[PDB]
């Protein structure tokens, strides 16, 4: 229905396709084509498009949301080197040693604990010798600050949040080496403000395309996220590891 | 982008999925299962859904608009019996004698004259003996009433309009038997009015989902169409024929 599409596109507009964060996160990543890359939680395909353009790598985007996959395919028709599939990544199987990089931006919070482990084991199998695992995800921080409105928000969206430390260790337990686990919450805050800023600046143009209710919902939502981060309820985690085989 | 989707869903809302006209047009059509049916210009798939529900027919929907096909697929999962494909019907090939009925609602105006004929020749081939061809389409009427605003509207949308009489003769020239060609413009006005009435009645609800600009565009658009029809610029044509035994 129209409501789901409207929120998908409205969020894409305010995040400017997510291109700022992707750019920075891949700024020190080096691939030689024709590398093969998997993007877990590929959304509207922006990260896949960018990775292909920057590296001329084959990119395979998986997302559980069929609407988004449909849009992604439509946005990236010509490029034979970019592929998309609608499926729960937990139900995917790829051959051993298929990928040079497996990349995932803010998708893994959607998995319960055992399922996070299950995915990382899969990722280990699917990577080529020397392959890299590259992830951002939301992590638990000051649970002593967690309150009734926060818990109900996470419970409702079905997020499963863990500390950066435990996350890094969980990856390490799947045989990954060179495991790096960094708090990038300061950068998260900066991205969030820039996105709220864009929304407020462009309110009039936004309303030509989106109903007033959505503008208000997104403004209030971004405002809450910024407040959540400033209160240190959660950290944005950055993780990089390598399959050394 | 969002604008294209918004107009697709907004028009689907005001026409209530096309249910009313589809129900009437098929009221004296009898099929036994498991008939096969082709819907040319299937849009969001509502006609396909209805035909499968009413007859337990296998239905194959073709539309040139990939966005609509994508939505149609998502709206109709379980029904193994309903299939969709994004393609120009002119580029499609089916084995001879595949279908019990070929059905098309307000699509063929999108085809230039030679292409209309090519399509009907294809339809003749694709039908089983005694198979039914069932079409509604917009036809030219009082061309002495056409003015610069009407000409520019059709030239811009790339419509090719011909008189009901010539349309009927064209179908006959492809070997179809028992060709019926009827003016249903009275019925067309009644549908248009009801759709405009729905839009005006539900303005406040419509605006929770659609931008104010779309409401105005659709209201003015439906107002124009009603005006065009009353001025007898065009007729809504009904055509039914059968392949010879
Ligand atoms: C917030 S988004 C981020 C994706 C976006 N392309 C970006 O720039 O990060 C998280 C995505 O992960 C997808 N997702 C959630 N659970 C998933 C699963 N089990 N398998 C695959 N994708 C999933 C969601 O549909 C959503 O599109
Ligand atoms: C006004 S719509 C009606 C759609 C659907 N029959 C209905 O009644 O809702 C006409 C449809 O024909 C489709 N169409 C136009 N040219 C076509 C072609 N060459 N092949 C297949 N579909 C086409 C358009 O995309 C559009 O969805």
UniProtKB/TrEMBL annotation, chains A, B:
Reaction(s) catalysed by this chain's protein = N,N-dimethylethanolamine phosphate + S-adenosyl-L-methionine = phosphocholine + S-adenosyl-L-homocysteine + H(+); N-methylethanolamine phosphate + S-adenosyl-L-methionine = N,N-dimethylethanolamine phosphate + S-adenosyl-L-homocysteine + H(+); phosphoethanolamine + S-adenosyl-L-methionine = N-methylethanolamine phosphate + S-adenosyl-L-homocysteine + H(+)
Per UniProt, the keywords (alphabetical) are: Methyltransferase, S-adenosyl-L-methionine, Transferase
Top enzyme class, one word, equals transferase
Question: Which Pfam families does the record associate with it?
Answer: Methyltransf_25 (PF13649)
Name this polypeptide is given: phosphoethanolamine N-methyltransferase
Q: In which pathway does it act?
A: Phospholipid metabolism; phosphatidylcholine biosynthesis; Lipid metabolism
Q: Name one GO molecular function term.
A: phosphoethanolamine N-methyltransferase activity
- Gene3D superfamilies, per the entry: Vaccinia Virus protein VP39
* Binding-site residues for S-adenosyl-L-methionine, renumbered to this chain: 63, 88-89
């Amino acid at each position: 229905g129209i409501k789901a599409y409207e929120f998908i596109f409205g969020e894409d507009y305010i995040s400017s396709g997510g291109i700022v964060a992707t750019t920075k996160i891949l700024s020190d990543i080096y691939l030689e084509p024709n590398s093969k890359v998997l993007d877990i939680g590929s959304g509207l395909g922006g990260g896949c498009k960018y990775i292909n353009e920057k590296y001329d790598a084959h990119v395979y985007g998986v997302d559980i949301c069929e609407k988004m996959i449909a849009i992604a395919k439509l946005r990236n028709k010509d490029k034979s080197k970019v592929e998309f599939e609608a499926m729960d990544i937990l139900k995917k199987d790829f051959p051993e040693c298929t990928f040079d990089m497996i990349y995932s931006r803010d998708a893994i919070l959607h998995l319960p604990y055992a399922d996070k482990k299950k995915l990382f084991e899969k990722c280990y199998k699917w990577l080529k010798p020397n392959g890299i695992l590259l992830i951002t995800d939301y992590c638990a921080d000051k649970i002593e600050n967690w309150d009734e409105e926060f818990k109900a928000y996470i419970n409702k969206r079905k997020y499963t949040l863990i500390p950066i430390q435990d996350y890094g260790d969980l990856i390490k337990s799947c045989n990954f080496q060179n495991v790096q686990a960094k708090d990038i919450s300061d950068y998260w805050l900066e991205l969030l403000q820039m996105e709220l800023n864009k929304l407020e600046e462009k309110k009039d143009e936004f309303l030509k395309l989106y109903p007033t209710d959505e503008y208000n919902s997104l403004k209030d939502g971004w405002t809450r996220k910024i407040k959540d981060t400033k209160r240190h309820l959660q950290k944005w985690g950055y993780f990089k590891a390598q399959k050394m085989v």
